[PDB]
Amino acid sequence: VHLTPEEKTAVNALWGKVNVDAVGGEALGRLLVVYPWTQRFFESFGDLSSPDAVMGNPKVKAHGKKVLGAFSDGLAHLDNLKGTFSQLSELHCDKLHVDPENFRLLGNVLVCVLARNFGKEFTPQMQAAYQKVVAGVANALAHKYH
Amino acid sequence: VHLTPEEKTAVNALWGKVNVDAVGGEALGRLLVVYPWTQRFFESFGDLSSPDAVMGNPKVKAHGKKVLGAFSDGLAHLDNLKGTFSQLSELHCDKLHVDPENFRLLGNVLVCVLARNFGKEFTPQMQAAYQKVVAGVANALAHKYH
Amino acid sequence: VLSPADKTNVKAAWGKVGAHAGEYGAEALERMFLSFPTTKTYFPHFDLSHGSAQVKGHGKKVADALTNAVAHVDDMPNALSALSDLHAHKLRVDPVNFKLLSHCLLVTLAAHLPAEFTPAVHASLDKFLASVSTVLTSKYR
Amino acid sequence: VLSPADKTNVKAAWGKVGAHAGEYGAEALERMFLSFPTTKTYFPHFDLSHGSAQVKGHGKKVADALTNAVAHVDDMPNALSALSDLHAHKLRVDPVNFKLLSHCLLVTLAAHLPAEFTPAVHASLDKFLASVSTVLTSKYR
Ligand code: HEM
Ligand code: HEM
Ligand code: HEM
Ligand code: HEM
Ligand SMILES: [C-]#N
Ligand SMILES: [C-]#N
Ligand SMILES: [C-]#N
Ligand SMILES: [C-]#N
Ligand SMILES: [C-]#N
Ligand SMILES: [C-]#N
Ligand SMILES: [C-]#N
Ligand SMILES: [C-]#N
Ligand SMILES: [C-]#N
Ligand SMILES: [C-]#N
Ligand SMILES: [Fe+3]
Ligand SMILES: [Fe+3]
Ligand SMILES: [Fe+3]
Numbered sequence: 001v002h003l004t005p006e007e008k009t010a011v012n013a014l015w016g017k018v019n020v021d022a023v024g025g026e027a028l029g030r031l032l033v034v035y036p037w038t039q040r041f042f043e044s045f046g047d048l049s050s051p052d053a054v055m056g057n058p059k060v061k062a063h064g065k066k067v068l069g070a071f072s073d074g075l076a077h078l079d080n081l082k083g084t085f086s087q088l089s090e091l092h093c094d095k096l097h098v099d100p101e102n103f104r105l106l107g108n109v110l111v112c113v114l115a116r117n118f119g120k121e122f123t124p125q126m127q128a129a130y131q132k133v134v135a136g137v138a139n140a141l142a143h144k145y146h
Numbered sequence: 147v148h149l150t151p152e153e154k155t156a157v158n159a160l161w162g163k164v165n166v167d168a169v170g171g172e173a174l175g176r177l178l179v180v181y182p183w184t185q186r187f188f189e190s191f192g193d194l195s196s197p198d199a200v201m202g203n204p205k206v207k208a209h210g211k212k213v214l215g216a217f218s219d220g221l222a223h224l225d226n227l228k229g230t231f232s233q234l235s236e237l238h239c240d241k242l243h244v245d246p247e248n249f250r251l252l253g254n255v256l257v258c259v260l261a262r263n264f265g266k267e268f269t270p271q272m273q274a275a276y277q278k279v280v281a282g283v284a285n286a287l288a289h290k291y292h
Numbered sequence: 293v294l295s296p297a298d299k300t301n302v303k304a305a306w307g308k309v310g311a312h313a314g315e316y317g318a319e320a321l322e323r324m325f326l327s328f329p330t331t332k333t334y335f336p337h338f339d340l341s342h343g344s345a346q347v348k349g350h351g352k353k354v355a356d357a358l359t360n361a362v363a364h365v366d367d368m369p370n371a372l373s374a375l376s377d378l379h380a381h382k383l384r385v386d387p388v389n390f391k392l393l394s395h396c397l398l399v400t401l402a403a404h405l406p407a408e409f410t411p412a413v414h415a416s417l418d419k420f421l422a423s424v425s426t427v428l429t430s431k432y433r
Numbered sequence: 434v435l436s437p438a439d440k441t442n443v444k445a446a447w448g449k450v451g452a453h454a455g456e457y458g459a460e461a462l463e464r465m466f467l468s469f470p471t472t473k474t475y476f477p478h479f480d481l482s483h484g485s486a487q488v489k490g491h492g493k494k495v496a497d498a499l500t501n502a503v504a505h506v507d508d509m510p511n512a513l514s515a516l517s518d519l520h521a522h523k524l525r526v527d528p529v530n531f532k533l534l535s536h537c538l539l540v541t542l543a544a545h546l547p548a549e550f551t552p553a554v555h556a557s558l559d560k561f562l563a564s565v566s567t568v569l570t571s572k573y574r
Contacts (some may be wrong), residue, residue: 026552033552034559036431040384051553097330099388108536116543116550124460127540128468139292144285146228179411180418182572186525197412243471245529254395262402262409270319270342273399274327293510293517293571369434376434419571426567430434430560 001078001136007129014118014126015075024064027113029055031106038102071110074137081140089143100142107134147224147282153275154224160264160272161221169263170214171207173256175200181251187242217256220283227286239290246288253280294419299365301416306362308408309401313359316404318351320397328392334385361424372427379428390425397421435560440506442557447503449549450542454500457545459484459492461538469533475526502565509568520569531566538562 003011032039032054039048045059054060070088077084092098111130115122149157178185178200185194191205200206216234223230238244257276261268294302309316325332325340325347332340339346357375364371379385398417402409435443450457463484466473473481480487498516505512520526539558543550 030552030555034556036380036556037384037386037429040386051551051556055552097333099330099386101388102386111536112539112543112550112555115540116547119544119547122540122544124464124467127464127537131468144288144292146226146282146286146289176411176414180415182521183525183527183570186527197410197415201411243474245527247529248527257395258398258402258409258414261399262406265403265406268399268403270323270326273323273396277327293568293573295573298573427434430436432434432436432439 001081001132003078003129003132007132010126011129011133012075014114014121014130015072017118018068018114019117020065020068020072021061023110023113023117024066024068025061026055026064026117027106027110028064028067029057029060030109030113032060034109035102035105038105041096041098067106071133071137074140075133078133078136081136082143082145085137085140086143089141092141093143100138100144103138103141104135107138110134147227147278149224149275149278153278156272157275157279158221160260160267161218163264164214164260165263166214167211168207169210169256169259170212170217171210172201172262173252173259174210174213175203175206176255176259177248177252178206180255181248184248184251187244213252217279217283220286221279224279224282227282228289231283231286231289235287235289238287246284246291249284249287250281253284256280294365294416294423297412298416298419301413302362302365302420305401305408305413305417306359308405312404313355314348314352316351316397316400317353317355317358318348319400320393321347321351321354323396323399324393327396328389331389331392334383334389358424361420365420368423368427369430369432372424373433375428376430376432380431385429387425387429390421390429394418394421394425435506435557435564438553439557439560442554443503443506443561446542446546446549446554446558447500449546453545454496455489455493457492457538457541458494458496458499459489461534461541462488462492462495464537464540465534468537469530472530472533475524475530499565503561506561506564509564510571510573513565513568514574516569517571517573521572522574526570528566528570531562531570535559535562535566 032042032048033051039054042048042060042063045057045063047053047057048060070085073084074081082089092103093100111127111134114130115127118126178188178194179197188194188205188209191203191209193199194203194206216231219230220227238249257273257280260276261273264272306313322342326342338344338350357372360371361368369376398409398414398421401417402414447454466481466488479485479491498513501512502509510517539555539562542558543555
């Protein structure tokens with residue numbers, strides 16, 4: 001992922017303000033509520049029967065933080081996303097059988113969560129930069145090599 | 147794309163019997179009829195307002211041969227589809243802005259055409275091998291988005 | 293959204309399929325499990341071996357559901373609510389899998405009914421299957 | 434297929450948007466043009482270098498169409514037939530672009546309505562926009 005010097009500064013400036021405990025759980029929670037079928041992959045997490053159950057689920061919150069941790073690792077190595085995430089892509093594809101389309105969906109949910117939490121500060125320009133970042137992460141986890 | 151020595155022999159044997167003057171045109175024609183928005187990319191072809199208008203359009207048949215030729219080149223070097231489709235990827239992605247999902251659709255339409263033309267010969271095993279082939283071709287054309 | 297012509301094409305085409313619907317349903321599943329192996333994870337307790345009686349019988353039930361959808365093409369959500377319950381509420385099947393099965397059914401039809409599987413029919417059936425897929429993967433009660 | 438809860442969520446959320454609808458529609462468009470530059474090829478005659486009066490005025494038309502779709506959520510094919518004629522028959526807009534605009538509208542709503550954009554409302558709005566997109570990209574005359 002190439003980001004202009006201005007974008008990298010803007011992106012990292014915002015990420016430095018992110019409360020991973022709140023944003024991570026909200027992003028994973030919204031994924032499961034907005035795209036219901038993703039709940040199948042998280043059966044072991046317990047009760048995911050309703051929006052309230054999902055958002056208040058302890059495992060969902062804790063796991064969302066780990067997801068955000070992976071995004072953090074991505075932002076720190078934008079020039080080596082596929083190398084950084086190859087093990088993760090293997091886990092998600094070969095072991096968990098997660099269809100690639102879902103990676104894009106989580107990226108978009110995260111973008112919506114950033115917008116909800118930062119409001120006006122999440123400008124069209126800030127979004128444009130983050131879209132490049134989430135697209136890079138999703139592409140790295142899908143890992144459609146040749 | 148990884149095909150066993152037997153899948154490769156099977157895929158090439160079937161391909162060798164393909165009617166090169168019609169199959170490509172049938173696949174492109176079906177793409178244009180089944181997924182209507184794809185017509186926007188071929189407005190210079192004139193009338194495509196109906197199934198018969200599309201399938202009988204000489205420009206569709208002619209262009210289909212070009213598409214078929216590309217698949218032939220792909221089958222000839224299954225281990226380097228990326229390099230083989232490098233220039234084509236530039237054209238479709240950077241120049242025409244064709245969304246990647248459409249590459250997958252044409253691949254699937256081609257599979258349907260092969261099944262229609264070969265019938266009982268296009269076994270579930272034959273299809274499985276070809277799905278790998280068209281997925282690899284679509285992936286290679288989408289490399290500029292990677 | 294299906295046009296009047298789409299509905300006529302689907303009804304005409306499925307009528308041609310006739311009593312062979314069950315067989316085509318089984319083959320579609322067989323083709324899906326082989327081309328897209330991950331789909332087998334949805335049937336862990338099934339005997340998925342090629343030619344399995346369980347797959348054959350299941351394919352007939354799938355075909356019967358499609359026949360019912362054709363008969364109620366203008367009110368599918370209502371006609372298929374029990375299948376939405378199963379696929380969306382209980383099984384939580386990923387919509388991508390419906391595209392895979394729909395595709396394999398179109399391949400099956402093309403292989404068996406070359407003359408009837410015209411571009412127009414192909415187009416109408418694809419939309420019909422997409423609509424059925426949306427109903428089965430949506431929670432709307 | 435929207436559930437009763439989805440329809441209520443969407444009507445309540447859009448009701449809250451109220452007269453800001455036009456502005457949000459314009460912002461969603463600007464976000465789409467900026468984040469996904471390829472979408473600009475559909476508006477060659479528009480002043481897209483910024484949030485021009487043309488983009489604002491167009492955002493208003495889009496918003497009004499959505500307001501109409503929200504009001505007639507159970508009769509969208511008929512209610513938006515003119516928009517289907519334009520998007521599906523004349524412009525032949527690739528469906529991917531509707532996902533892009535829909536996503537940008539959700540981002541806009543989230544940024545402006547933090548408290549109203551709950552997970553449930555977000556979910557309902559996404560399905561609603563997907564249904565609207567299907568209508569506008571489908572040929573059903
Ligand atoms: C594109 C963004 C995503 C990122 C960055 C991400 C990251 C991660 C990470 C870091 C783990 C932890 C595994 C470990 O300890 O090494 C994980 C686990 C997992 N992920 Fe994802 N993931 C993403 C998307 C998805 C999607 C879309 C799904 C499916 C809907 C999914 C399903 C799972 C499942 C089922 C697990 C295992 C959970 C468990 O039982 O512990 N992930 N992911
Ligand atoms: C299996 C995937 C595809 C293959 C192998 C393929 C192959 C080709 C080839 C070989 C050409 C000829 C280039 C030349 O004249 O030098 C071409 C042109 C073109 N393709 Fe594709 N294509 C694929 C998918 C698509 C899709 C999905 C679209 C859009 C819906 C598309 C739109 C076009 C257009 C607009 C042209 C230029 C037509 C013209 O003005 O002459 N292609 N393609
Ligand atoms: C054209 C779309 C589909 C139709 C019309 C359809 C129809 C049906 C029907 C009628 C049943 C049987 C209910 C009963 O009488 O017990 C069923 C069961 C089931 N379907 Fe589907 N289905 C479709 C797609 C899918 C897809 C894509 C998957 C996932 C790969 C799937 C997974 C299942 C599973 C796991 C069961 C339950 C099997 C069991 O344990 O008994 N279906 N389906
Ligand atoms: C939620 C989805 C959408 C809605 C509700 C919508 C609505 C509308 C409306 C109401 C018009 C104006 C018709 C009139 O003249 O009165 C319009 C025009 C147009 N739309 Fe959309 N639209 C949507 C998505 C899209 C997308 C994704 C694209 C492509 C990026 C697009 C491209 C266009 C174009 C090119 C025009 C004609 C503009 C002109 O020349 O004036 N629309 N749309
Ligand atoms: C991963 N959630
Ligand atoms: C690498 N694509
Ligand atoms: C390339 N991976
Ligand atoms: C790619 N390496
Ligand atoms: C990878 N090239
Ligand atoms: C990269 N292959
Ligand atoms: C390219 N057809
Ligand atoms: C490959 N990057
Ligand atoms: C159901 N297969
Ligand atoms: C229409 N935008
Ligand atoms: Fe790699
Ligand atoms: Fe690549
Ligand atoms: Fe229906």
